[PDB]
């Protein structure tokens, strides 16, 4: 009974509608919850003053991020080792910082398009949501966690991703959710019909196969989930058992699996420190028909008498003879704030933004370390037409035993769909899996086990429209909409 037009009631409902958006992502996977969450954001800001709207947008974000990324508590607790209330204080600060961008979006949309109208809801909102979400993923190196439409990896809109990227699905979901909110508030059937047509049109695109599989190039791949406990991983006494654990798991696979993979920083020692182990392993792998890629840390002495420490992937074995001077390697480019460096200016150095694909046993792998797999444009920029598989290695203990590793895993799936390549995901303990060229999960082992995933995987060829272009077609769309919306407010 009309309680909705009290500002404090709008703030509370925004928290609920924002929290509802968390159900859209893995492991919950209720993709309609993304539309309901966006409907609340669009509707709760109708007929509000700009700062009233910004507060509602902030509270929507606080429910979304407060419920969606509170697993970073485990990251902070594992990193800092401080009492609980201290880590809660930092988590609330994180969710509050990210909610500035959802409040930015609501405040500006209310300031420039105050009226409840199709223009505000279907033209201005998706274009401005694209800008404010870019800023969230760019400012201070950014944190673009939780974009709806990553929830469409198994949904009716998935065919959009190979054409224009996952951000196109962010764009369309906001558009459709606005017109549903518009139809509800104005009690009008026309915006609902347009919303249904807009939602339904991209459905036949999921029956498009942009890739060409190569069945006779199929190889057996093994991914060693060593499951080193995080409290022990970097202890100096653990190093010798870690190398034992991984070598013993790999020995029965040599000569059977063409490609063997160890996860991020599996060898918890400097690369210069392990030349005896690496050289011996390389020869045994070459003598059998096998190849190995593994994570490690590299403190490399540079031209100016100093060491740049990297989070790196190295290659060994058949078709990739190991050498400390070999260019057949990958250095992490996008480091994690506080975890791997500090925003001010022992830290990690960054590899180049674009690095060549890894080569191993005649296989070409486009690599990204952990978090980097969510950087869709960056993964696309490193992709090459001759890339056979996408590769990501990660240590998802930093994501908790919670929803964290599943949200990370979900977004890695989008890379395979966007580029029409199989994705090899090797992790220390959290969701090791092979993803097919359409985002489907071909093989997977349970978390928190010490075992290896061995299966057949088939490489693909072909270029999706998104692999050809990248983000610029969507950007010219938000520019055309932004130009039109700004002029329409004449
Ligand atoms: C003529 C050439 C155009 C080239 C550019 C085209 C770019 C794509 C444009 C798509 C626009 C989609 C707009 C969708 C707009 C929906 C408006 C609506 O539902 O209004 C309901 C009210 O009327 C009820 O009273
Ligand atoms: C605050 C005022 C009102 C704003 C309304 C929304 C305006 C949106 C317009 C933005 C224009 C930005 C144009 C930026 C164009 C850059 C193109 C680009 O970066 O392409 C991607 C590359 O990776 C290549 O693939
Ligand atoms: C003082 C200035 C403050 C600037 C603040 C910048 C805002 C963005 C911060 C995001 C932190 C996100 C932390 C999320 C934890 C991810 C950890 C991770 O991905 O690590 C996996 C892998 O093991 C590692 O290589
Ligand atoms: C308002 C400004 C923005 C708000 C800022 C407040 C948030 C700070 C919270 C946690 C920092 C601790 C980060 C811990 C990151 C996880 C550790 C990690 O990822 O380690 C990587 C690995 O150890 C090496 O490869
Ligand atoms: C179609 C579903 C509609 C559901 C509407 C009510 C949503 C309430 C649930 C909010 C999400 C809470 C998730 C908490 C998980 C977490 O914080 O770890
Ligand atoms: C702040 C005053 C101008 C505001 C104009 C709004 C549109 C420009 C805002 C900057 C975001 C554009 C970033 C593009 C980056 C890229 O395309 O890769
Ligand atoms: Cl680690
Ligand atoms: Mg080539």
UniProtKB/Swiss-Prot annotation:
Gene: lnt
Protein name: Apolipoprotein N-acyltransferase
Disruption phenotype: Essential. Depletion induces juxtapositioning of inner and outer membranes and alters the architecture of the cell envelope. It causes mislocalization of outer membrane lipoproteins. The mutant has a copper-sensitive, temperature sensitive phenotype.
UniProt topological domain (Periplasmic) ranges: 25-30, 66-83, 139-165, 208-470
Cytoplasmic compartment spans: 1-6, 46-49, 114-117, 187-188
Keywords on record: Acyltransferase, Cell inner membrane, Cell membrane, Membrane, Transferase, Transmembrane, Transmembrane helix
The enzyme's E.C. designation: 2.3.1.269
Subcellular localization(s) per the UniProt record: Cell inner membrane
Family: Belongs to the CN hydrolase family. Apolipoprotein N-acyltransferase subfamily.
Organism domain of life: Bacteria
Known partners and oligomeric status: Monomer.
Membrane topology: Multi-pass membrane protein
GO cellular component: outer membrane-bounded periplasmic space; plasma membrane
UniProt effect for mutating residue 336 to A: Loss of activity
């Amino acid at each position: 009974a009309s309680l909705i037009e009290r500002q404090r009631i709008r703030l509370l409902l925004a928290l609920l509608f924002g929290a509802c958006g968390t159900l859209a992502f893995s492991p919950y996977d209720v993709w309609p919850a993304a539309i309901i969450s966006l409907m609340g954001l669009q509707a709760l800001t109708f007929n509000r003053r700009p700062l009233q709207s910004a507060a509602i947008g902030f509270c929507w974000g606080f429910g979304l991020f407060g419920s969606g990324i509170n697993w970073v508590y485990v990251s902070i607790a594992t990193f800092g080792g401080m009492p609980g209330p201290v880590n809660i204080f930092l988590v609330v600060l994180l969710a509050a910082y990210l909610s500035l961008y959802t409040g930015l979006f609501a405040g500006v949309l209310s300031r420039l398009w105050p009226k409840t109208t199709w223009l505000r809801v279907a033209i201005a909102a998706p274009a401005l949501w694209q800008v404010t979400e870019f800023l969230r993923g760019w400012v201070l190196t950014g944190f673009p966690w939780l974009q709806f439409g990553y929830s469409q990896i198994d949904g009716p809109l998935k065919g959009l991703a190979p054409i224009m990227g996952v951000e196109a699905i962010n764009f369309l979901l906001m558009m459709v959710s606005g017109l549903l909110a518009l139809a509800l508030v104005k009690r009008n059937w026309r915006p609902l019909v347009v919303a249904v047509v807009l939602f339904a049109l991209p459905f036949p695109l999921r029956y498009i196969q942009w890739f060409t599989p190569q069945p006779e190039k199929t190889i057996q791949v093994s991914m060693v989930q060593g499951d080193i406990p995080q409290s022990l991983k970097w202890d100096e006494g653990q190093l010798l058992n870690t190398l034992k654990i991984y070598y013993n798991a790999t020995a029965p696979l040599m000569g059977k699996s063409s490609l063997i993979i160890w996860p991020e920083s599996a060898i918890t020692d400097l690369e210069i420190n392990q030349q005896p182990f690496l050289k011996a392993l390389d020869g045994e792998l070459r003598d059998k028909g096998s190849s190995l890629v593994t994570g490690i840390v590299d403190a490399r002495l540079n031209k100016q008498n100093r060491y740049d420490t990297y989070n790196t992937i190295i290659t060994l074995g058949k078709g990739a003879p190991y050498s400390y001077e070999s260019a057949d390697r990958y250095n992490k480019n996008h480091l994690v704030p506080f975890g791997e460096f500090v925003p001010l200016e022992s830290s990690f150095s960054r590899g180049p933004y674009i690095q060549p694909p890894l080569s191993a046993n005649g296989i070409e792998l486009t690599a990204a370390i952990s978090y980097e797999i969510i950087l869709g444009e960056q993964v696309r920029d490193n992709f090459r037409p001759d890339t056979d598989y996408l590769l990501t290695i990660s240590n998802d203990a930093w994501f908790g035993k919670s929803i964290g590793p599943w949200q990370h895993f979900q977004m890695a799936r989008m890379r395979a769909l966007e580029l029409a390549r199989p994705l090899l995901r090797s992790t220390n303990n959290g969701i090791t899996a092979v993803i097919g060229p359409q985002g489907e999960i071909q093989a997977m082992i349970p978390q928190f086990t010490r075992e290896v995933l061995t299966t057949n995987v088939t490489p693909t060829t072909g270029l999706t429209p998104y692999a050809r272009t990248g983000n610029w077609p969507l950007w010219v769309l938000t520019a055309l909409f932004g130009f039109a919306a700004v002029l329409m407010s004449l």
